[PDB]
Design a protein around this ligand. Structure first.
Ligand code: CL
Length: 457
């Protein structure tokens, strides 16, 4: 009756002092497993949530705290808060300016959003993303940045909240804190950054973030290194401006050092190698990046990654990187001396067999043949490639249902056919027929390569 009276009292008065004292009591009662029941039983949650609209900060503070306590301990308070319209009221409170108050509020949101897609969608509809991002760009209070970064991390895996957080300028905002002395704050920002950076729209003002990510690759903390490598990989995929910036701040050396120190830890090498693959292609300084991998002692370890214990994702990425490295003439000989060709060929042969009987082996087929196509620009490499009895296989790939495989197969044959002895071997393999057909390929690259092979023979 008392608690019930207290709730009603609070939930009715218009005189602010009746609010302070009532809220205070409920608060004080929530310190014990009992009060978390008196309030809950007496329908306090809907009343408290109602007080989240109070004009008296003193009130708001008391209500959000009691709610926080119930949310933390009281079984069944999270669904009750949701039902009462708690989420909308809390997001609306994110425009307040008291950091202790904001820390309690954002923490309630984290507790409610975690493992609950429904709440994540409501936070989004209520404007949660922009409001959380503004907090990261405004305050310095660690407890608040941390709690807010946790709400962002929870929303960052939602296909709907993700693009909204990115649009609100979230990645740049999170980037501001990557050198904060608070490790828990840095790591949460990196985890959120990794989820958001995957397939995000192109952003402006990413310079600082990119420079800091490269520096973090040298960290002794594995989780920091793994995240920095993953973010760099995501942000450089088909983004020539980011590739340029990353290369300009020493990204190639840093990444190579990272792969070297990673050893067989694929959680680090796989993304670092994908980043290197992005940085060694299609941007103004790609050639320079191709040379830089060599110059910083990267060729031997890149080839080594093609061998066990490497798993498929890593091998796929590594093959892709070698393909780009081979575009640089000065890497032709060293890649050959380091043994890239026979391993690429063994991978190709085995991968093809599987297709004739996660990463799809068709991707490895295309990948290796593609790398061989580029390596074949060098005469000594053509001798090695040919000496490994690859021609019969390349010709067989002409019959592939996949156009891209048809393309690199015709392309590597095209390079090989520039040497008369090879042209005869290719013809002896009965490549004329399949090549002829491919002349009418809707895929212009295929058609164009088929024609060049036919000419050379
Ligand atoms: Cl080998």
């Amino acid at each position: 009756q008392m608690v019930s009276a207290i709730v009603r009292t609070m939930q009715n008065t218009n005189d602010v002092e009746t609010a302070r004292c009532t809220a205070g009591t409920l608060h004080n009662l929530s310190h014990h497993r009992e009060g978390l029941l008196a309030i809950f039983k007496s329908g306090g949650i809907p009343a408290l949530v109602k007080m989240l609209g109070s004009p008296v900060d003193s009130v708001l503070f008391y209500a959000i705290t009691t709610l926080h306590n119930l949310l933390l301990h009281q079984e069944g308070a999270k669904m009750a808060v949701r039902l009462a319209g708690g989420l909308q009221k809390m997001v609306a409170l994110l425009n307040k300016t008291n950091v202790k108050f904001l820390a309690i509020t954002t923490d309630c949101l984290q507790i409610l959003a975690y493992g609950n897609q429904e709440s994540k969608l409501i936070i989004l509809a209520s404007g949660g993303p922009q409001a959380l991002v503004n907090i990261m760009r405004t305050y310095t209070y660690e407890k608040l940045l941390w709690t807010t970064s946790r709400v962002l991390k929870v929303l960052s895996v939602c296909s709907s909240n993700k693009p909204a957080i990115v649009e609100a300028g979230g990645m740049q905002a999170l980037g501001l804190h990557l050198t904060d002395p608070s490790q828990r704050l840095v790591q949460n920002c990196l985890w959120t950054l990794r989820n958001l950076s995957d397939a995000a729209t192109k952003q402006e003002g990413m310079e600082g973030l990119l420079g800091t990510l490269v520096q973090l690759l040298g960290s002794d903390d594995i989780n920091v290194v793994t995240c920095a490598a993953g973010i760099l990989s995501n942000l450089t995929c088909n983004n020539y401006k980011n590739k340029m910036m990353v290369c300009q701040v020493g990204g190639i050396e840093a990444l190579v050092r990272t792969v070297l120190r990673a050893g067989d830890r694929e959680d680090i090498t796989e993304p670092a190698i994908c980043a290197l693959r992005h940085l060694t292609s299609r941007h103004q300084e790609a050639e320079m990046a191709q040379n830089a991998v060599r110059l910083h002692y990267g060729l031997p370890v890149v080839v080594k990654l093609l061998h066990p214990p490497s798993h498929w994702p890593l091998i796929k990425a590594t093959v892709g990187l070698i393909r780009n490295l081979a575009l640089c003439p000065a890497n032709h000989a060293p890649l050959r001396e380091q043994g890239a060709i026979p391993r690429l060929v063994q991978l190709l042969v085995r991968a093809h067999q599987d297709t004739q009987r996660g990463v799809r082996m068709e991707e490895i087929v295309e990948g290796c043949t593609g790398a061989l196509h580029i390596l074949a620009r060098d005469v000594h490499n053509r001798i090695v490639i040919r000496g490994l009895n690859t021609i019969p296989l390349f010709v067989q790939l002409l019959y592939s249902p996949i156009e891209n495989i048809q393309r690199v197969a015709a392309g590597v044959l095209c390079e090989l056919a520039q040497d008369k002895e090879a042209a005869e071997a290719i013809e002896a393999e009965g490549a004329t027929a399949p090549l002829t057909e491919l002349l009418h390929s809707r895929n212009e690259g295929v058609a164009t390569y088929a024609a060049a092979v036919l000419f050379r023979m």
